[PDB]
Amino acid sequence: VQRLTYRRRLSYNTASNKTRLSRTPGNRIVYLYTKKVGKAPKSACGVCPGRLRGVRAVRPKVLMRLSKTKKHVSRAYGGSMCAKCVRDRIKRAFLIEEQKIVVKVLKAQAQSQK
Amino acid sequence: SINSRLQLVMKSGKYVLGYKQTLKMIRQGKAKLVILANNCPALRKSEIEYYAMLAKTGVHHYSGNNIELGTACGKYYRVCTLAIIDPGDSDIIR
Amino acid sequence: RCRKNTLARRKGRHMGIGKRKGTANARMPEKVTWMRRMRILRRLLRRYRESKKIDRHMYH
Amino acid sequence: AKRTKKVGIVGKYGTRYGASLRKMVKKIEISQHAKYTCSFCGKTKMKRRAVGIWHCGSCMKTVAGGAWTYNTTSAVTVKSAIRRLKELKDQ
Amino acid sequence: PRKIEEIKDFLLTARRKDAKSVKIKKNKDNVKFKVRCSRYLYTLVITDKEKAEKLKQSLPPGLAVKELK
Amino acid sequence: GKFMKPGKVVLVLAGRYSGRKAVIVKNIDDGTSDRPYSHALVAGIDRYPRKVTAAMGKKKIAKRSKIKSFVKVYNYNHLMPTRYSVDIPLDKTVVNKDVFRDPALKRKARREAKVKFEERYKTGKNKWFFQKLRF
Amino acid sequence: GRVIRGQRKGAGSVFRAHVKHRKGAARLRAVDFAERHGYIKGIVKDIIHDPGRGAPLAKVVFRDPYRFKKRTELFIAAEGIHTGQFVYCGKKAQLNIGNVLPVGTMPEGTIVCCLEEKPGDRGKLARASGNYATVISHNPETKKTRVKLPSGSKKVISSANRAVVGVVAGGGRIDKPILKAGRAYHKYKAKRNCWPRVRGVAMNPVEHPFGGGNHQHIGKPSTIRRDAPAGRKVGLIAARRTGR
RNA sequence: AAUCCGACUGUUUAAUUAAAACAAAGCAUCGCGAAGGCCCGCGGCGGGUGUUGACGCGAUGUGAUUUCUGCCCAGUGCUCU
RNA sequence: CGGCGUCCGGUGAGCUCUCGCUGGCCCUUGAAAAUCCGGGGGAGAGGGUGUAAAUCUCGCGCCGGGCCGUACCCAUAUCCG
RNA sequence: CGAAGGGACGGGCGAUGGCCUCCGUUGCCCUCGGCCGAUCGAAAGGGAGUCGGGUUCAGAUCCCCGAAUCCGGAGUGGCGG
Ligand SMILES: [Zn+2]
């Protein structure tokens, strides 16, 4: 049993000083400074508690080197809108447009009759 | 009343409970009428009515809650959208 | 020397009333006796479910 | 009655703060932590996230309401009274 | 480093302009073919004896073929 | 009753072609023992034609009036019927159930449907089918 | 004598408001053409909790009728406001809970909150946690309106200002007592350093006009005149009566 | 086993006094609808409360729970026309 | 410079760290900005039947990354008394 | 109690620069435009990207060996897809 020290000048257990234990080929144990755990993007509706699928969850400045297909999903409103609510917006916008046609037909008969 | 007329179907007629199962049910069109709850989402108010006017299906809006509509069918769970297959001996359809 | 002593601990030796400093909840807590028992018993009922020993109604 | 006789939710407050002040908040703590039913879905998943705010677990319909109860007795009378003047203006 | 599975891709990699000396390892039925490029150490694993020698004379550009002991 | 007809305009719910407009050409509504759910064969467009505005001439209006089409079997619960109707021919010798197994004929089916969809975009007939749904 | 406490609260720097975790100012919309003549429709996205305030805030998003953006507002939520509910704003808007519209236009007797005192300052009156304002009568000439404020005083205000219809969500906050010093310590920690109030009798007479003596007594009449100087206006300030 | 005090957790005179002292939830008042109440500032179309609006802000007295809080406005204050 | 070896397994409410799920408490609701990314749109582009504009860069290749601190103690002897 | 932008896309005019074919440069004109204000403020907050072995009397994620990775550039685009 051997005890080990830090490798940097940060001797505080802050959120930017999170380490993991690993074994070297030199037959000793040393700390490895981990990166922060990224989070998947949220949906634009705000009514789905989960996070988007098919998109990598990593720190936001790591998104530059990732590919296009790794950052979104091949769909309309892809990579920023959950699949549950985007297809509900299709059937939300369509029924308004049909109802607006219904209202203006009943509005038109009012012009002709009175 | 409506609920007393509805419960006659329950032990005699054929019925389908649930939004998804009645969403496909209207698409064959052998159903005649649907009951909608008042508290169900406003998107799914018009969604059934647009399918119903394609299949010439009558729409009746229940005054009670979805929990009360579930108790009106004799079941112990709430129901949002239901459709009748064939009334046994009831005149819910006119 | 401890390995000789721990073999007596497997046989219950040096573990009378007069060598017990903690409570019953301190040594083997009342939670873990319940925590364990709900793995063995609830697994036994579910393994008997797909083997058709007990149907859904009596198992529930 | 099963475990304690009449203290219940204020059984955590112990011998202190008097019986009456413990008795006053006993009606508050039950209504504060009660799983109320929903007026949108119907499921009993209504919780107090913060002061005056009412949130559902299933559809997550977030309703501004009372500090401890879901609907206060003032607001239900106000809503009925303000509806009375709605068709009174309209007719 | 990049692991190469099939033979001919190593031949096209080893004749690249940026490539340099090839280091040969004999891991007692795990003969490895390591070639140094500017970015990646491309290694080819050969698990059979007789496949090794036909790749010895298949290096065109007179590149360094130092036997790594 | 049954309102999915081979001339019905149907919106697409999910998939890569979400929000696009499709015309039913084949309605199985039975299941073929390999696709057991009820389903239909639809023909739709992907790239909507842009504005024309009668001011960009003759070469650019042809460029703007370009339509990219597709074909794919969708679910009945993954589709949205209208009470609009387009009676575009889409003859049965090209668009069939045996087209998805051959990518060469699926390019042929898309190409054949593209020309027939292009002609109906002209002359102002069935005009609502040719603007993208504003969602 | 040194400067007494309370007198020290006017200089600040220890007694200033804790506005770090606060989410903004609770104000109504600014006046424009759409609000003055017709109505504009808004969507309540979500409801948040403002630290140091007993009332929740409703996050209402409007679309600007002039340039293509969505404008976010900080509305005080009425009791009965849910997310996704359409909220109307203007003169032509209808009469229901969660609908701000001018005071000169609805019939008298309604229950309104977040009342605007002067026309064009986005609401000032009756917006604390559950308070409300009631309208007694209108006046078509001179465009005046008598509104009963929650303090009981009736103020004649202009008919061009507006309020949101309903009561403030979060009523009955003072019904449950604190029951602890810690819950009182945490209550004012979000607001400002004013909770540990030491009574002036136990204090030494150099910090207070009531302190001193071998017995904990005041020694002077606690009712002090209105025109008293600072450091002397301590106690019952210009009391008309003192008892029950 | 009793008596007194403080209900309690907490804080207090760093370096003689850790308490029955202070604070504390509770209780009862007073002023104020914003050109306002309290206060700071030599000064300003200044500033804090206030990213606040009577379920709030500011100044008080008492000190958990239970019970009760009687009489007196002649005096000194405060306030009203 | 060589010879070999650096092996097989099972456990435990075991201690520590990390990830994830769920629950409880608030009159406490628990930070901002730099920066990056995705989507709605189609202002515009290119090419005419062998080729281009494009390549939120698909793979490989080239160059560069400038300034300051980096020794030792970190405590019954390297600090303040 | 403020004439608080010196920025940008496209087009027109004129010029130089390199094989003024092309690309590039700047001046004027048309056009678009906000965002809450200069600036400072954390070696424990946010913050892209380095690890293994060896090596010194005293430095080593910094020196050597070997493996990577991030950012910026590229006109003629350096090559392929
Ligand atoms: Zn609900």
Coordinates of C-alpha atoms in Angstrom, one line a residue, chain F residues 31-124:
Chain F
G31 CA -50.2 -6.7 -43.5
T32 CA -48.1 -8.7 -45.9
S33 CA -46.8 -11.3 -43.3
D34 CA -43.4 -9.6 -43.4
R35 CA -44.7 -6.1 -42.6
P36 CA -47.5 -7.2 -40.3
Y37 CA -48.8 -3.8 -39.2
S38 CA -51.3 -1.9 -41.4
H39 CA -49.4 0.4 -43.8
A40 CA -49.5 2.3 -47.0
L41 CA -47.3 3.2 -49.9
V42 CA -47.0 6.9 -50.4
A43 CA -45.3 9.3 -52.8
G44 CA -44.1 12.7 -51.6
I45 CA -41.6 15.5 -52.2
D46 CA -38.6 16.6 -50.2
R47 CA -37.3 19.9 -51.6
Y48 CA -40.2 22.3 -52.0
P49 CA -40.1 24.7 -55.0
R50 CA -39.2 28.3 -54.0
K51 CA -40.9 31.6 -54.9
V52 CA -41.2 32.7 -58.5
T53 CA -42.4 36.3 -58.1
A54 CA -42.6 37.0 -61.9
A55 CA -39.5 39.2 -61.7
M56 CA -36.4 36.9 -62.0
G57 CA -36.9 36.1 -65.7
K58 CA -37.1 32.7 -67.5
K59 CA -33.9 30.8 -66.6
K60 CA -34.2 31.4 -62.9
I61 CA -37.9 30.5 -62.7
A62 CA -37.0 27.1 -64.1
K63 CA -34.3 26.8 -61.4
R64 CA -36.8 27.8 -58.7
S65 CA -39.4 25.3 -59.9
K66 CA -37.4 22.2 -59.1
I67 CA -38.9 19.4 -57.0
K68 CA -37.1 16.6 -55.3
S69 CA -39.4 13.6 -54.6
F70 CA -39.1 10.3 -52.6
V71 CA -41.0 7.1 -51.9
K72 CA -41.3 5.2 -48.6
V73 CA -43.7 3.0 -46.8
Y74 CA -45.0 4.6 -43.6
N75 CA -47.3 3.5 -40.8
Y76 CA -50.9 4.5 -40.5
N77 CA -50.2 5.9 -37.0
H78 CA -47.2 7.7 -38.4
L79 CA -49.2 9.6 -41.0
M80 CA -51.8 12.4 -41.1
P81 CA -54.7 12.4 -43.6
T82 CA -56.3 15.5 -45.0
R83 CA -59.6 15.9 -46.8
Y84 CA -57.7 17.4 -49.8
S85 CA -57.2 15.1 -52.7
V86 CA -54.7 15.0 -55.7
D87 CA -55.5 12.6 -58.5
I88 CA -51.9 12.4 -59.9
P89 CA -51.6 9.2 -61.9
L90 CA -48.4 7.4 -60.6
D91 CA -48.8 4.3 -62.8
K92 CA -48.4 0.9 -61.2
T93 CA -45.7 -0.4 -63.4
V94 CA -43.0 1.8 -61.8
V95 CA -44.0 2.3 -58.1
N96 CA -44.5 -1.0 -56.4
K97 CA -43.7 -2.9 -53.3
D98 CA -40.7 -4.7 -54.9
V99 CA -38.8 -1.4 -55.4
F100 CA -37.0 -0.9 -52.0
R101 CA -34.9 -4.0 -52.6
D102 CA -33.2 -2.5 -55.7
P103 CA -31.6 0.9 -55.4
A104 CA -31.5 1.3 -59.2
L105 CA -35.2 1.1 -59.6
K106 CA -35.8 3.2 -56.5
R107 CA -33.9 6.0 -58.3
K108 CA -36.0 5.2 -61.3
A109 CA -39.2 5.4 -59.2
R110 CA -38.1 8.7 -57.7
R111 CA -37.2 10.1 -61.2
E112 CA -40.5 9.0 -62.7
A113 CA -42.5 10.5 -59.9
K114 CA -40.4 13.7 -60.0
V115 CA -41.4 14.5 -63.6
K116 CA -45.1 13.8 -62.9
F117 CA -45.0 16.0 -59.8
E118 CA -43.2 18.7 -61.7
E119 CA -46.0 19.1 -64.3
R120 CA -48.7 19.5 -61.7
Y121 CA -46.7 22.2 -59.9
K122 CA -47.2 24.2 -63.2
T123 CA -50.6 25.5 -64.3
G124 CA -51.5 26.4 -60.7

